[PDB]
Amino acid sequence: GAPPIMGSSVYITVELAIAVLAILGNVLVCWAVWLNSNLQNVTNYFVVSLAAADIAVGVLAIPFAITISTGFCAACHGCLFIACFVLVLTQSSIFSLLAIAIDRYIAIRIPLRYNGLVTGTRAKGIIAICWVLSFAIGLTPMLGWNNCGQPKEGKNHSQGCGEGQVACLFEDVVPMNYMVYFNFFACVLVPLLLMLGVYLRIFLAARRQLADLEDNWETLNDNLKVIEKADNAAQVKDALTKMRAAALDAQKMKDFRHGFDILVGQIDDALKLANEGKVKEAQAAAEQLKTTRNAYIQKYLERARSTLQKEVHAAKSLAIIVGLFALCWLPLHIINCFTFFCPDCSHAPLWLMYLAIVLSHTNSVVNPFIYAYRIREFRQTFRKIIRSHV
Ligand SMILES: CC(C)CCC[C@@H](C)CCC[C@@H](C)CCC[C@@H](C)CCCC(=O)OC[C@@H](O)[C@@H](O)CO
Ligand SMILES: CC(C)CCC[C@@H](C)CCC[C@@H](C)CCC[C@@H](C)CCCC(=O)OC[C@@H](O)[C@@H](O)CO
Ligand SMILES: CC(C)CCC[C@@H](C)[C@H]1CC[C@H]2[C@@H]3CC=C4C[C@@H](O)CC[C@]4(C)[C@H]3CC[C@]12C
Ligand SMILES: CC(C)CCC[C@@H](C)[C@H]1CC[C@H]2[C@@H]3CC=C4C[C@@H](O)CC[C@]4(C)[C@H]3CC[C@]12C
Ligand SMILES: CC(C)CCC[C@@H](C)[C@H]1CC[C@H]2[C@@H]3CC=C4C[C@@H](O)CC[C@]4(C)[C@H]3CC[C@]12C
Ligand SMILES: Nc1nc(NCCc2ccc(O)cc2)nc2nc(-c3ccco3)nn12
Ligand SMILES: CCCCCCCCCCCCCCCCCC
Ligand SMILES: CCCCCCCCCCCCCCCCCC
Ligand SMILES: CCCCCCCCCCCCCCCCCC
Ligand SMILES: CCCCCCCCCCCCCCC
Ligand SMILES: CCCCCCCCCCCCCCC
Ligand SMILES: CCCCCCCCCCCCCCC
Ligand SMILES: CCCCCCCCCCCCCCC
Ligand SMILES: CCCCCCCCCCCCCCC
Ligand SMILES: CCCCCCCCCCCCC
Ligand SMILES: CCCCCCCCCCCCC
Ligand SMILES: CCCCCCCCCCCCC
Ligand SMILES: CCCCCCCCCCCC
Ligand SMILES: CCCCCCCCCCC
Ligand SMILES: CCCCCCCCCC
Ligand SMILES: CCCCCCCC
Ligand SMILES: CCCCCCCC
Ligand SMILES: CCCCCCCC
Ligand SMILES: CCCCCC
Ligand code: NA
């Protein structure tokens, strides 16, 4: 076979290229949030936590990956730390993505409560806690769930390791039951499914809000036409009672209020006339409603639609991030599943292991590109930083 160093040179070169790009792109993210107070919100605190995890992939995880590819002799607990540290960063990523999804879910479901439920001070606490949990989950093998007690003597002697040392190779020291049941099923796949569920609920909530606006609008307009071709007070009375309900629902910032005050007032004026039997005065009063609608209500309606559309677009953008996370990490997990559940199967070849590893690391490059393409405030801040400071 070809000298191993030839394939190793390609591996190391690609890992270093990923490292540089992971560091540069994610530093730009952090720099942008620092510069631009418009980007300084709780959602972006999680973005910065995720960018920090991606910088740490370039600075630490990639160097550790290069090291462990050599099978160097190491004390088994030192080997575990180098093998498992990337699991801490990946777990931190998962918590940041989960926090973002729930943040956007609260923002769309209880917008009035959001700013008092979800504060910077609480966010910072949540981020600290998530990082501590990430260290505990990813370094669980250091607590004894490891293969350090069952060393590969063949490898130890061939690499000529000293006493207490192992040839530091991932699948020799990290148990596959940990990787499949604990890391993959419990710590990765369950959070990804929860995130899928939350995004689904976001899109369902936006659509139901947009439906309710459009139904209130159409209720207004249709009862306006009922009133016009009406024949008696009872008809006009009913159509106005329906308009009043529709109007109060639509309502649930000074110029906005004034507009609905004019509407409900005009409705209530036409309501008192109807009761007293004056059908034509009620019908005439109701013709006023059309200019209030055109001047005030159609403006609030289109503003509300435009806000919801922006929330849906932002939610799509963040869901893309989760989808790319999944794309980049699932191959390695699926390979581990074959290793573990199919002992009759040939192990995935080395070249495929290293491709899957490289793909996992490429995840730490992509997010700054998604922000730049999808989120105008990031794109514009990146432009300013690049022009001015380069
Ligand atoms: C990637 C680049 C663009 C940016 C990187 C930035 C800088 C700061 C990287 C820092 C790298 C270091 C943290 C790397 C640590 C390397 C360690 C893990 C090597 C360990 C090797 C070792 O133990 O020696 C081998 C022998 O001692 C062994 O065989 C016997 O014990
Ligand atoms: C995020 C997504 C939208 C795009 C990501 C792009 C992905 C596919 C990365 C592209 C890189 C590849 C085209 C090149 C990688 C080739 C490497 C993995 C070959 C590995 C060779 C090998 O087996 O070397 C290691 C061993 O031979 C042994 O010597 C240990 O070092
Ligand atoms: C501020 C940052 C850069 C500090 C980085 C510290 C890192 C590189 C240190 C902390 C713990 C260290 C490990 C401690 C124990 C061992 C076992 C030994 O047999 C081989 C080296 C090895 C595996 C060390 C490699 C380097 C190491 C991983
Ligand atoms: C998430 C998206 C990108 C799908 C990726 C699926 C990948 C991970 C799948 C596609 C086909 C799969 C391979 C098909 C056959 C074998 C041979 C078996 O003896 C070891 C596992 C191995 C090598 C599988 C590992 C995982 C694999 C490479
Ligand atoms: C995509 C997300 C939502 C689900 C992930 C599906 C994973 C867990 C599935 C997809 C394909 C599956 C593999 C398909 C084939 C085999 C070979 C069999 O001898 C053992 C089970 C094994 C190795 C399966 C294990 C579980 C597996 C890897
Ligand atoms: N299975 C696996 N192996 C490795 N590296 C070792 C690749 C390899 C596997 C077999 C071999 O004989 C020589 C090298 N890194 C790995 N990282 C992960 C991982 C991280 C998150 C999910 O899986 N899994 N994983
Ligand atoms: C992109 C900057 C330069 C790229 C680095 C060149 C790669 C050569 C280093 C070779 C060292 C090999 C160490 C042992 C590997 C054996 C693993 C089986
Ligand atoms: C908001 C700043 C980020 C906070 C990061 C601090 C993390 C400190 C290290 C975590 C300690 C947990 C120990 C559990 C694993 C022990 C295994 C030997
Ligand atoms: C298994 C699910 C994975 C599906 C991937 C979802 C991503 C869709 C891509 C469309 C939008 C991408 C915007 C910019 C792409 C830049 C990529 C570096
Ligand atoms: C070998 C390094 C892999 C880096 C691959 C990262 C892909 C990022 C997408 C960039 C697309 C830019 C398109 C501009 C027109
Ligand atoms: C920053 C304050 C300390 C955080 C306290 C974390 C609470 C941990 C509760 C149970 C630990 C479960 C870890 C799984 C091994
Ligand atoms: C054989 C080396 C084992 C070292 C483990 C000692 C540290 C105890 C871990 C406590 C974890 C607390 C984290 C908060 C959940
Ligand atoms: C999302 C579905 C996840 C469940 C996958 C569990 C698969 C277990 C595979 C059992 C294989 C045992 C091998 C027997 C020869
Ligand atoms: C990065 C994940 C996608 C990899 C696509 C390549 C699939 C080819 C798999 C063939 C491997 C068969 C080797 C078994 C001996
Ligand atoms: C409000 C913006 C603050 C930016 C914080 C930057 C944190 C960077 C930590 C990266 C750690 C990698 C080693
Ligand atoms: C704007 C507040 C966000 C602070 C997040 C910073 C996270 C830094 C953790 C560094 C751990 C890297 C090993
Ligand atoms: C006594 C040699 C093996 C011990 C492994 C040390 C790993 C944990 C210490 C690193 C601290 C992180 C900054
Ligand atoms: C600048 C960072 C380069 C990566 C460091 C390489 C570490 C390889 C150690 C080899 C162990 C025998
Ligand atoms: C280290 C400061 C940021 C420099 C910006 C250079 C271009 C960023 C490239 C993104 C992959
Ligand atoms: C575990 C991740 C959940 C983060 C929730 C987001 C903020 C809610 C504060 C009440
Ligand atoms: C593998 C399941 C996670 C996908 C979630 C992405 C939502 C578009
Ligand atoms: C239902 C799970 C049991 C299969 C375990 C197989 C381990 C190789
Ligand atoms: C990028 C593909 C790696 C090489 C595949 C075949 C090597 C035997
Ligand atoms: C200059 C970096 C060399 C990589 C380790 C052999
Ligand atoms: Na990450």
mmCIF file with all atom_site columns, all heavy atoms in Angstrom, residues 185-201:
data_model
loop_
_atom_site.group_PDB
_atom_site.id
_atom_site.type_symbol
_atom_site.label_atom_id
_atom_site.label_alt_id
_atom_site.label_comp_id
_atom_site.label_asym_id
_atom_site.label_entity_id
_atom_site.label_seq_id
_atom_site.pdbx_PDB_ins_code
_atom_site.Cartn_x
_atom_site.Cartn_y
_atom_site.Cartn_z
_atom_site.occupancy
_atom_site.B_iso_or_equiv
_atom_site.pdbx_formal_charge
_atom_site.auth_seq_id
_atom_site.auth_comp_id
_atom_site.auth_asym_id
_atom_site.auth_atom_id
_atom_site.pdbx_PDB_model_num
ATOM 1   N N   . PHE A 1 185 ? -27.955 8.908  20.328 1.00 0.00 ? 185 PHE A N   1
ATOM 2   C CA  . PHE A 1 185 ? -29.419 8.799  20.550 1.00 0.00 ? 185 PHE A CA  1
ATOM 3   C C   . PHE A 1 185 ? -29.885 9.866  21.540 1.00 0.00 ? 185 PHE A C   1
ATOM 4   O O   . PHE A 1 185 ? -30.806 10.656 21.224 1.00 0.00 ? 185 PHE A O   1
ATOM 5   C CB  . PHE A 1 185 ? -29.821 7.388  20.975 1.00 0.00 ? 185 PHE A CB  1
ATOM 6   C CG  . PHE A 1 185 ? -29.752 6.344  19.884 1.00 0.00 ? 185 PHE A CG  1
ATOM 7   C CD1 . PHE A 1 185 ? -29.987 5.011  20.196 1.00 0.00 ? 185 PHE A CD1 1
ATOM 8   C CD2 . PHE A 1 185 ? -29.447 6.634  18.577 1.00 0.00 ? 185 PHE A CD2 1
ATOM 9   C CE1 . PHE A 1 185 ? -29.922 4.016  19.226 1.00 0.00 ? 185 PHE A CE1 1
ATOM 10  C CE2 . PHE A 1 185 ? -29.386 5.634  17.606 1.00 0.00 ? 185 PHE A CE2 1
ATOM 11  C CZ  . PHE A 1 185 ? -29.626 4.334  17.928 1.00 0.00 ? 185 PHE A CZ  1
ATOM 12  N N   . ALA A 1 186 ? -29.270 9.919  22.717 1.00 0.00 ? 186 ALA A N   1
ATOM 13  C CA  . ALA A 1 186 ? -29.788 10.739 23.816 1.00 0.00 ? 186 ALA A CA  1
ATOM 14  C C   . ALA A 1 186 ? -29.369 12.196 23.652 1.00 0.00 ? 186 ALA A C   1
ATOM 15  O O   . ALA A 1 186 ? -30.221 13.067 23.852 1.00 0.00 ? 186 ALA A O   1
ATOM 16  C CB  . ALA A 1 186 ? -29.343 10.171 25.154 1.00 0.00 ? 186 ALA A CB  1
ATOM 17  N N   . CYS A 1 187 ? -28.110 12.473 23.284 1.00 0.00 ? 187 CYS A N   1
ATOM 18  C CA  . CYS A 1 187 ? -27.548 13.838 23.374 1.00 0.00 ? 187 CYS A CA  1
ATOM 19  C C   . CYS A 1 187 ? -27.582 14.588 22.050 1.00 0.00 ? 187 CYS A C   1
ATOM 20  O O   . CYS A 1 187 ? -27.523 15.814 22.107 1.00 0.00 ? 187 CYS A O   1
ATOM 21  C CB  . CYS A 1 187 ? -26.128 13.815 23.921 1.00 0.00 ? 187 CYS A CB  1
ATOM 22  S SG  . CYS A 1 187 ? -26.137 13.327 25.654 1.00 0.00 ? 187 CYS A SG  1
ATOM 23  N N   . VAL A 1 188 ? -27.762 13.891 20.947 1.00 0.00 ? 188 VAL A N   1
ATOM 24  C CA  . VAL A 1 188 ? -27.786 14.556 19.626 1.00 0.00 ? 188 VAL A CA  1
ATOM 25  C C   . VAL A 1 188 ? -29.169 14.394 18.968 1.00 0.00 ? 188 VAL A C   1
ATOM 26  O O   . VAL A 1 188 ? -29.793 15.405 18.633 1.00 0.00 ? 188 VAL A O   1
ATOM 27  C CB  . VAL A 1 188 ? -26.649 14.012 18.756 1.00 0.00 ? 188 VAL A CB  1
ATOM 28  C CG1 . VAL A 1 188 ? -26.749 14.520 17.325 1.00 0.00 ? 188 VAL A CG1 1
ATOM 29  C CG2 . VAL A 1 188 ? -25.304 14.407 19.387 1.00 0.00 ? 188 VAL A CG2 1
ATOM 30  N N   . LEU A 1 189 ? -29.585 13.171 18.755 1.00 0.00 ? 189 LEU A N   1
ATOM 31  C CA  . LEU A 1 189 ? -30.794 12.902 17.937 1.00 0.00 ? 189 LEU A CA  1
ATOM 32  C C   . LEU A 1 189 ? -32.041 13.426 18.672 1.00 0.00 ? 189 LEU A C   1
ATOM 33  O O   . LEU A 1 189 ? -32.875 14.082 18.051 1.00 0.00 ? 189 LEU A O   1
ATOM 34  C CB  . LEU A 1 189 ? -30.850 11.401 17.702 1.00 0.00 ? 189 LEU A CB  1
ATOM 35  C CG  . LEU A 1 189 ? -31.938 10.933 16.752 1.00 0.00 ? 189 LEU A CG  1
ATOM 36  C CD1 . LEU A 1 189 ? -31.788 11.618 15.402 1.00 0.00 ? 189 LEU A CD1 1
ATOM 37  C CD2 . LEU A 1 189 ? -31.858 9.424  16.600 1.00 0.00 ? 189 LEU A CD2 1
ATOM 38  N N   . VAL A 1 190 ? -32.155 13.186 19.966 1.00 0.00 ? 190 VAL A N   1
ATOM 39  C CA  . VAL A 1 190 ? -33.343 13.699 20.707 1.00 0.00 ? 190 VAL A CA  1
ATOM 40  C C   . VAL A 1 190 ? -33.408 15.222 20.636 1.00 0.00 ? 190 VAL A C   1
ATOM 41  O O   . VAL A 1 190 ? -34.438 15.762 20.252 1.00 0.00 ? 190 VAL A O   1
ATOM 42  C CB  . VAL A 1 190 ? -33.434 13.129 22.141 1.00 0.00 ? 190 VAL A CB  1
ATOM 43  C CG1 . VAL A 1 190 ? -34.477 13.897 22.957 1.00 0.00 ? 190 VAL A CG1 1
ATOM 44  C CG2 . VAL A 1 190 ? -33.809 11.680 22.061 1.00 0.00 ? 190 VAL A CG2 1
ATOM 45  N N   . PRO A 1 191 ? -32.330 15.991 20.914 1.00 0.00 ? 191 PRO A N   1
ATOM 46  C CA  . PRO A 1 191 ? -32.379 17.432 20.721 1.00 0.00 ? 191 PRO A CA  1
ATOM 47  C C   . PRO A 1 191 ? -32.686 17.839 19.274 1.00 0.00 ? 191 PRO A C   1
ATOM 48  O O   . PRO A 1 191 ? -33.461 18.787 19.105 1.00 0.00 ? 191 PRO A O   1
ATOM 49  C CB  . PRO A 1 191 ? -31.008 17.909 21.242 1.00 0.00 ? 191 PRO A CB  1
ATOM 50  C CG  . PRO A 1 191 ? -30.680 16.901 22.282 1.00 0.00 ? 191 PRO A CG  1
ATOM 51  C CD  . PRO A 1 191 ? -31.139 15.583 21.708 1.00 0.00 ? 191 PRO A CD  1
ATOM 52  N N   . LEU A 1 192 ? -32.194 17.113 18.279 1.00 0.00 ? 192 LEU A N   1
ATOM 53  C CA  . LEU A 1 192 ? -32.476 17.519 16.877 1.00 0.00 ? 192 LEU A CA  1
ATOM 54  C C   . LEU A 1 192 ? -33.976 17.352 16.613 1.00 0.00 ? 192 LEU A C   1
ATOM 55  O O   . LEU A 1 192 ? -34.580 18.255 16.018 1.00 0.00 ? 192 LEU A O   1
ATOM 56  C CB  . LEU A 1 192 ? -31.656 16.706 15.896 1.00 0.00 ? 192 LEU A CB  1
ATOM 57  C CG  . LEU A 1 192 ? -30.191 17.099 15.797 1.00 0.00 ? 192 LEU A CG  1
ATOM 58  C CD1 . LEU A 1 192 ? -29.446 16.075 14.936 1.00 0.00 ? 192 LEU A CD1 1
ATOM 59  C CD2 . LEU A 1 192 ? -30.037 18.511 15.277 1.00 0.00 ? 192 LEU A CD2 1
ATOM 60  N N   . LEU A 1 193 ? -34.543 16.248 17.078 1.00 0.00 ? 193 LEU A N   1
ATOM 61  C CA  . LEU A 1 193 ? -36.002 15.996 16.900 1.00 0.00 ? 193 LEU A CA  1
ATOM 62  C C   . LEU A 1 193 ? -36.781 17.071 17.645 1.00 0.00 ? 193 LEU A C   1
ATOM 63  O O   . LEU A 1 193 ? -37.747 17.565 17.091 1.00 0.00 ? 193 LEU A O   1
ATOM 64  C CB  . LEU A 1 193 ? -36.344 14.588 17.376 1.00 0.00 ? 193 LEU A CB  1
ATOM 65  C CG  . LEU A 1 193 ? -35.785 13.471 16.497 1.00 0.00 ? 193 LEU A CG  1
ATOM 66  C CD1 . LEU A 1 193 ? -36.145 12.121 17.074 1.00 0.00 ? 193 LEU A CD1 1
ATOM 67  C CD2 . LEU A 1 193 ? -36.268 13.595 15.048 1.00 0.00 ? 193 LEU A CD2 1
ATOM 68  N N   . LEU A 1 194 ? -36.353 17.457 18.846 1.00 0.00 ? 194 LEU A N   1
ATOM 69  C CA  . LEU A 1 194 ? -37.058 18.514 19.596 1.00 0.00 ? 194 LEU A CA  1
ATOM 70  C C   . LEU A 1 194 ? -36.994 19.798 18.799 1.00 0.00 ? 194 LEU A C   1
ATOM 71  O O   . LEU A 1 194 ? -37.987 20.556 18.762 1.00 0.00 ? 194 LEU A O   1
ATOM 72  C CB  . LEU A 1 194 ? -36.431 18.704 20.972 1.00 0.00 ? 194 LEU A CB  1
ATOM 73  C CG  . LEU A 1 194 ? -36.679 17.569 21.968 1.00 0.00 ? 194 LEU A CG  1
ATOM 74  C CD1 . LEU A 1 194 ? -35.939 17.859 23.271 1.00 0.00 ? 194 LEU A CD1 1
ATOM 75  C CD2 . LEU A 1 194 ? -38.158 17.368 22.222 1.00 0.00 ? 194 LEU A CD2 1
ATOM 76  N N   . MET A 1 195 ? -35.820 20.127 18.274 1.00 0.00 ? 195 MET A N   1
ATOM 77  C CA  . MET A 1 195 ? -35.674 21.339 17.442 1.00 0.00 ? 195 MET A CA  1
ATOM 78  C C   . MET A 1 195 ? -36.619 21.284 16.243 1.00 0.00 ? 195 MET A C   1
ATOM 79  O O   . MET A 1 195 ? -37.197 22.335 15.942 1.00 0.00 ? 195 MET A O   1
ATOM 80  C CB  . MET A 1 195 ? -34.245 21.544 16.946 1.00 0.00 ? 195 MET A CB  1
ATOM 81  C CG  . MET A 1 195 ? -33.377 22.031 18.024 1.00 0.00 ? 195 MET A CG  1
ATOM 82  S SD  . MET A 1 195 ? -31.657 22.116 17.408 1.00 0.00 ? 195 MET A SD  1
ATOM 83  C CE  . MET A 1 195 ? -30.707 21.073 18.498 1.00 0.00 ? 195 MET A CE  1
ATOM 84  N N   . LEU A 1 196 ? -36.709 20.166 15.550 1.00 0.00 ? 196 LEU A N   1
ATOM 85  C CA  . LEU A 1 196 ? -37.629 19.971 14.397 1.00 0.00 ? 196 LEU A CA  1
ATOM 86  C C   . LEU A 1 196 ? -39.062 20.295 14.848 1.00 0.00 ? 196 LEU A C   1
ATOM 87  O O   . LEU A 1 196 ? -39.765 20.998 14.109 1.00 0.00 ? 196 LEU A O   1
ATOM 88  C CB  . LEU A 1 196 ? -37.563 18.536 13.885 1.00 0.00 ? 196 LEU A CB  1
ATOM 89  C CG  . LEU A 1 196 ? -38.569 18.169 12.781 1.00 0.00 ? 196 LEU A CG  1
ATOM 90  C CD1 . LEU A 1 196 ? -38.381 19.078 11.566 1.00 0.00 ? 196 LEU A CD1 1
ATOM 91  C CD2 . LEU A 1 196 ? -38.430 16.725 12.363 1.00 0.00 ? 196 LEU A CD2 1
ATOM 92  N N   . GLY A 1 197 ? -39.466 19.765 15.999 1.00 0.00 ? 197 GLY A N   1
ATOM 93  C CA  . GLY A 1 197 ? -40.792 19.979 16.594 1.00 0.00 ? 197 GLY A CA  1
ATOM 94  C C   . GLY A 1 197 ? -41.046 21.437 16.880 1.00 0.00 ? 197 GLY A C   1
ATOM 95  O O   . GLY A 1 197 ? -42.128 21.926 16.513 1.00 0.00 ? 197 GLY A O   1
ATOM 96  N N   . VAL A 1 198 ? -40.081 22.136 17.471 1.00 0.00 ? 198 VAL A N   1
ATOM 97  C CA  . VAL A 1 198 ? -40.194 23.584 17.799 1.00 0.00 ? 198 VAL A CA  1
ATOM 98  C C   . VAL A 1 198 ? -40.326 24.409 16.512 1.00 0.00 ? 198 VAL A C   1
ATOM 99  O O   . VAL A 1 198 ? -41.209 25.300 16.459 1.00 0.00 ? 198 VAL A O   1
ATOM 100 C CB  . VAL A 1 198 ? -39.045 24.088 18.671 1.00 0.00 ? 198 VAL A CB  1
ATOM 101 C CG1 . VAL A 1 198 ? -39.089 25.588 18.906 1.00 0.00 ? 198 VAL A CG1 1
ATOM 102 C CG2 . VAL A 1 198 ? -39.088 23.377 20.023 1.00 0.00 ? 198 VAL A CG2 1
ATOM 103 N N   . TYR A 1 199 ? -39.445 24.218 15.536 1.00 0.00 ? 199 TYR A N   1
ATOM 104 C CA  . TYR A 1 199 ? -39.547 24.949 14.252 1.00 0.00 ? 199 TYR A CA  1
ATOM 105 C C   . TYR A 1 199 ? -40.931 24.688 13.617 1.00 0.00 ? 199 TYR A C   1
ATOM 106 O O   . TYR A 1 199 ? -41.534 25.632 13.145 1.00 0.00 ? 199 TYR A O   1
ATOM 107 C CB  . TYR A 1 199 ? -38.361 24.661 13.322 1.00 0.00 ? 199 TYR A CB  1
ATOM 108 C CG  . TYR A 1 199 ? -37.180 25.508 13.719 1.00 0.00 ? 199 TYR A CG  1
ATOM 109 C CD1 . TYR A 1 199 ? -36.068 24.949 14.336 1.00 0.00 ? 199 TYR A CD1 1
ATOM 110 C CD2 . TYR A 1 199 ? -37.204 26.884 13.561 1.00 0.00 ? 199 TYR A CD2 1
ATOM 111 C CE1 . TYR A 1 199 ? -35.006 25.736 14.733 1.00 0.00 ? 199 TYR A CE1 1
ATOM 112 C CE2 . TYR A 1 199 ? -36.147 27.683 13.963 1.00 0.00 ? 199 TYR A CE2 1
ATOM 113 C CZ  . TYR A 1 199 ? -35.055 27.104 14.587 1.00 0.00 ? 199 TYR A CZ  1
ATOM 114 O OH  . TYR A 1 199 ? -34.037 27.885 15.031 1.00 0.00 ? 199 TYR A OH  1
ATOM 115 N N   . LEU A 1 200 ? -41.406 23.458 13.632 1.00 0.00 ? 200 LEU A N   1
ATOM 116 C CA  . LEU A 1 200 ? -42.741 23.079 13.092 1.00 0.00 ? 200 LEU A CA  1
ATOM 117 C C   . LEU A 1 200 ? -43.803 23.940 13.788 1.00 0.00 ? 200 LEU A C   1
ATOM 118 O O   . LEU A 1 200 ? -44.666 24.560 13.084 1.00 0.00 ? 200 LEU A O   1
ATOM 119 C CB  . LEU A 1 200 ? -42.979 21.601 13.369 1.00 0.00 ? 200 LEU A CB  1
ATOM 120 C CG  . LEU A 1 200 ? -43.551 20.784 12.217 1.00 0.00 ? 200 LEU A CG  1
ATOM 121 C CD1 . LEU A 1 200 ? -42.438 20.023 11.497 1.00 0.00 ? 200 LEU A CD1 1
ATOM 122 C CD2 . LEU A 1 200 ? -44.618 19.826 12.734 1.00 0.00 ? 200 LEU A CD2 1
ATOM 123 N N   . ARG A 1 201 ? -43.712 24.045 15.119 1.00 0.00 ? 201 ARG A N   1
ATOM 124 C CA  . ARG A 1 201 ? -44.673 24.826 15.935 1.00 0.00 ? 201 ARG A CA  1
ATOM 125 C C   . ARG A 1 201 ? -44.553 26.304 15.572 1.00 0.00 ? 201 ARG A C   1
ATOM 126 O O   . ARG A 1 201 ? -45.609 26.973 15.510 1.00 0.00 ? 201 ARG A O   1
ATOM 127 C CB  . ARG A 1 201 ? -44.480 24.591 17.425 1.00 0.00 ? 201 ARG A CB  1
ATOM 128 C CG  . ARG A 1 201 ? -44.974 23.228 17.872 1.00 0.00 ? 201 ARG A CG  1
ATOM 129 C CD  . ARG A 1 201 ? -44.738 23.029 19.346 1.00 0.00 ? 201 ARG A CD  1
ATOM 130 N NE  . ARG A 1 201 ? -45.802 22.232 19.945 1.00 0.00 ? 201 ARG A NE  1
ATOM 131 C CZ  . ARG A 1 201 ? -46.958 22.719 20.404 1.00 0.00 ? 201 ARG A CZ  1
ATOM 132 N NH1 . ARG A 1 201 ? -47.231 24.016 20.331 1.00 0.00 ? 201 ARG A NH1 1
ATOM 133 N NH2 . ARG A 1 201 ? -47.842 21.896 20.940 1.00 0.00 ? 201 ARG A NH2 1
#
